[PDB]
Design a binder for this molecule. Structure first.
Ligand SMILES: NS(=O)(=O)c1ccc(O)c(NC(=O)NCCc2ccccn2)c1
Ligand SMILES: [Zn+2]
Length: 257
């Protein structure tokens, strides 16, 4: 089974998921001087006021907060998108040290972590159908750097000790994901893929230029999670990121100058 170790990590994934070598894989390095400003791109519309968080889960590859996606409660619209995308979950990728952890890079710079807010296109009715479509998902990616604390992350950090090992979950209601967003919604966008198996080429990526800052204490709590299940040899959940993949026949567009 796939993971992030020497014998099951990203360089092995293509054996079970041959699309790993496909034409629109993620993440990628964002070369800021080569991204082209597109004046036709609209502002992103992030409408999270009615979000209903449900549960937080350690799935053995990250921790995920899930939302009620049975109605248009927390939706992403505008930007490069046509139609309405419902928020299903968010999760993070992070490093063993502050100089690595992000999936996307910016002029080869790696951030300490990366937040993925995962949304699916309501025209396909459910996320399983959306993953089989080239415009099925929109993932809003937000970089994390280490410095000052992010107060809106603290409720997440404080429950992680209850989901230490793979398969554990907890009720996580009334969490407001607006507390995770930076000031600016300036973004880069490109067509890509899921960054974990099945690596489906179904994602419009929207990566925010402005990182959020989190404290060293907050990221240390991420690094105390375990990849293993309870009772198995402890392997800290760190470095759960896929490296940048070939850009191939794609242009990254910027919403800003
Ligand atoms: N990391 S990401 O590109 O935001 C992203 C977003 C939504 C997703 O469903 C995934 N992939 C994911 O959750 N995979 C779960 C594990 C799995 C599911 C199906 C087959 C093999 N492995 C990644
Ligand atoms: Zn992700």
């Amino acid at each position: 089974h796939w993971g992030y170790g020497k014998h099951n990590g990203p360089e092995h994934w293509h054996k079970d998921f041959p699309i790993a070598k496909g034409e629109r894989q993620s993440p990628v390095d964002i070369d800021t001087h080569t991204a082209k400003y597109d004046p036709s791109l609209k502002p992103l519309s992030v409408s999270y006021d009615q979000a209903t968080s449900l549960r937080i889960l350690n799935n053995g590859h990250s921790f995920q907060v899930t939302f009620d996606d049975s109605q248009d409660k927390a939706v992403l619209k505008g930007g490069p998108l046509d139609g309405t995308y419902r928020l299903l979950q968010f999760h993070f990728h992070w490093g063993s040290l502050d100089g690595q952890g992000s999936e996307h890079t910016v002029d080869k710079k790696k951030y300490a972590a990366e937040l993925h807010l995962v949304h699916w296109n309501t025209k396909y009715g459910d996320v399983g159908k959306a993953v089989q479509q080239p415009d099925g998902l929109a993932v809003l990616g937000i970089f994390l750097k280490v410095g000052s604390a992010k107060p809106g992350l603290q409720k997440v950090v404080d429950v992680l000790d209850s989901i230490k090992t793979e398969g554990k979950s907890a009720d996580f209601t009334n969490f407001d994901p607006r507390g995770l967003l930076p000031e600016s919604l300036d973004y880069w966008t490109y067509p890509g893929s899921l960054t974990t198996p099945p690596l489906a080429e179904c994602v419009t990526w929207i990566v925010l230029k402005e990182p959020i800052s989190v404290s060293s204490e907050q990221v240390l709590k991420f690094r105390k999670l375990n990849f293993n299940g309870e009772g198995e040899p402890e392997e800290l959940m760190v470095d759960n990121w896929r490296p940048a993949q070939p850009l191939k026949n794609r242009q990254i567009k910027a919403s800003f100058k």
